[PDB]
Structures are given as structure tokens and as C-alpha cells.
Amino acid sequence: TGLYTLLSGVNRHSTAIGRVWLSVIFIFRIMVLVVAAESVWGDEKSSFICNTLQPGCNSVCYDQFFPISHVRLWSLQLILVSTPALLVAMHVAHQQHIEKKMISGTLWWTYVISVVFRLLFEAVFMYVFYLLYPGYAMVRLVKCDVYPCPNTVDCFVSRPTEKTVFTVFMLAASGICIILNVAEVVYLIIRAC
Amino acid sequence: TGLYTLLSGVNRHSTAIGRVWLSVIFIFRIMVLVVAAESVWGDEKSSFICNTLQPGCNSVCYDQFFPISHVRLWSLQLILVSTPALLVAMHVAHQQHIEKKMISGTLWWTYVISVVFRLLFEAVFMYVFYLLYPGYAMVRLVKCDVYPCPNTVDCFVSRPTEKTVFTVFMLAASGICIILNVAEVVYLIIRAC
């Protein structure tokens, strides 16, 4: 869990919000993603079927309706969100090594910049999820007319309801993280002056 | 066999060529067609297969390469060739009935016109066979690119060699019939003057 708290962005300049609340939500998202990765999204493509005899229609319809899986989007979001925290940690380690082999304002500015970047990454991933999948709910039946499928064919999705439940969980966690990051930057600015 | 000789065109004005030679060739063609109709052309479409998974490609390729079967063409040719003979026979019966209830030149002209029409029908059927199937030989493998078949597919024909043999027999018989009809009209014209 120490690696997770390091990836969250815990810093010596962090207040209570960034040290005890943001890290817990980060670990919660990690755990939910680990639980839901291969259990429920494992057979997303192998169980995807369409009512047709046309060869190759299943693959093209699946690619049309799922350009990128939800789990991969969440994994990329977590990696990109955790990147600035470890960047700051490596910078701190470099500064301490330089001190050993031989100010606070630089640390403060680095922390606020990293928090802003985390907020930006979370916001852009929320926006791209909204673009790709406008509704939080997943439907049982989809209509596909991509070549080489003739006319329009019916295709059926695996586990729509469980995927909807996990999507709601993940979106709520991301929204809470965005709100907490905004509160963190506002609190730091207020404490500055 | 009497019905066959009636359908050949035997008339009281017929010479030896039309009475003993043409009728025999007509009966020979009838017998060969009866032998070859369903024995060798029976499974022409059910055994026609193509190397593909595309639904509907077998039927469209068969229709593209065999617009009308050889056996049906020969049957239509025989029916149309035999039509003028029975037309003449019915006209003779009508004339005899009119005589009973109450010249030779009319009979002579009707006979020559019927022979000319038989020659024309045989010639046009030979020409249409040449148009549809330029080569007398049938090939084992054909290349088909008709929609919905993707790209070009290989399709295989049933009994190409036996069909080639029977085609040669039928074409030779038809050519002999054409030559005999031309000889008949020339001989009748010569005897006229």
C-alpha cells in the first residue's frame, strides 16, 4: 500500500485532503479495477455474437462498437494520473542526492503544478469517456451495418448490467477525485496568502 | 416409333432422304437425349461447389456459368423442329375432313415451306449454342467473380468429360440433319423443274 500512497501524490507539503483522502480513493480505484479487469471484461469479444452467416461480421461489429475497452481506458487513466506524483518523487530524490554529495519554494511550486496536471488528466479522460460512450448504461442488443455485414444485423453484448454497475462505481470515484483535486489547489492557494 | 416418324416430317411428297434418313437421325437424337437427360445432367447444380464460405455464391456462380442447361436447349430444339411436321399433318387431316364432308400443289408448297422452317430452326439453335458455349469441351474448374462472391473463387463442374462426349454426339447429329435438309430442298427444287 506504500507504493500506492506514493503514486497518489503524498508530499510533505500536502494537507489532510491530499494525504488521507485522495490516496484512499486512488487505492479504491486500483482495487476495483483489479477485481473487474478479467472477471467481467475477460470474455467481451469471445462471447460477442451476431445473427448472421457472413464471415468476419462479428469482429468488425465488435471493433465498431468498442473502439477501446473500458478497462484499458481506466488503466491508461490511472497510469497517466500516477505519472506526475512519481516524477515529483524522483525530483525530490535527485535534490536530496545532490545535497548529500555536496529551497522549499521549488518544492511548493512543483507540488502545485503536479496537482494541476493530475486534475487536467482526470478531466480529459472523463471527457474522452463521455465522447466514446455517452450513456453510463450498456445495452443488450446493438445494430451493426459495417462492411461486410449485409444490411443491418443484430449483435449481443456480454454482461451489460454488471458492466454498468462497475462503470457507475468508476465514474463516481473519478468525479470525487476531481472535486478533491480542485479543493486541494484552492486550499493551497488560500494558505499561500 | 410411328409417332416419331410422324414428328420427323414424313410426307407423301417426301423422297428417300426425308423418309428413311432424316427420321432415323431424329429418333437417334431423341434416344440419346432420353438416355443423357437425368443420368448425367441430373446433379448439375446440386454437385456444383465453390471454395468459399460466402453464402449464396454457389447459386449465383452456377447461374452465371450455365444460363440454360444443354439438355433443356436440346429439348427446346427438338420440340421446335418437330412443330412444323405436325402442323402439316394437321393441315392434311383438315383437308381430308373437308373432302369427306363434301390440290397437290398446295401440299407440295406446304412441304417445302415446312422443310425450310425446320432448316431455319436447326440453324438458329446451332448459332445460339455457339454463342452460349463457344467450345465443345467442358472444363473442370471455373473462375467466378459475381456478387456476392468476394474477389475471385474457384468452382468445380460435375462430369465434364461425359458431358463433352454427349455434346459431341448431339452436335454431330444436328449437323447431319442440317445437311440432309439442305439436300432435301435442293432435290425437291431439281425435281420440280
UniProtKB/Swiss-Prot annotation, chains A, B:
UniProt GO BP: cell-cell signaling; gap junction assembly; nervous system development
Effect seen on changing residue 12 to W: In CMTX1; moderate
Alphabetical UniProt keywords: Cell junction, Cell membrane, Charcot-Marie-Tooth disease, Dejerine-Sottas syndrome, Disease variant, Gap junction, Membrane, Neurodegeneration, Neuropathy, Phosphoprotein, Transmembrane, Transmembrane helix
Annotated phenotype, changing residue 34 to M: In CMTX1; localized in the Golgi apparatus but also forming rare small gap junction-like plaques
Effect of residue 50 to S: In CMTX1; suggests a failure to incorporate the mutant protein in the cell membrane
Signal sequence region: none
Record's disease association: Charcot-Marie-Tooth disease, X-linked dominant, 1: A form of Charcot-Marie-Tooth disease, a disorder of the peripheral nervous system, characterized by progressive weakness and atrophy, initially of the peroneal muscles and later of the distal muscles of the arms. Dejerine-Sottas syndrome: A severe degenerating neuropathy of the demyelinating Charcot-Marie-Tooth disease category, with onset by age 2 years. Characterized by motor and sensory neuropathy with very slow nerve conduction velocities, increased cerebrospinal fluid protein concentrations, hypertrophic nerve changes, delayed age of walking as well as areflexia. There are both autosomal dominant and autosomal recessive forms of Dejerine-Sottas syndrome.
Record's protein name: Gap junction beta-1 protein
Organism in which the protein naturally occurs: Homo sapiens
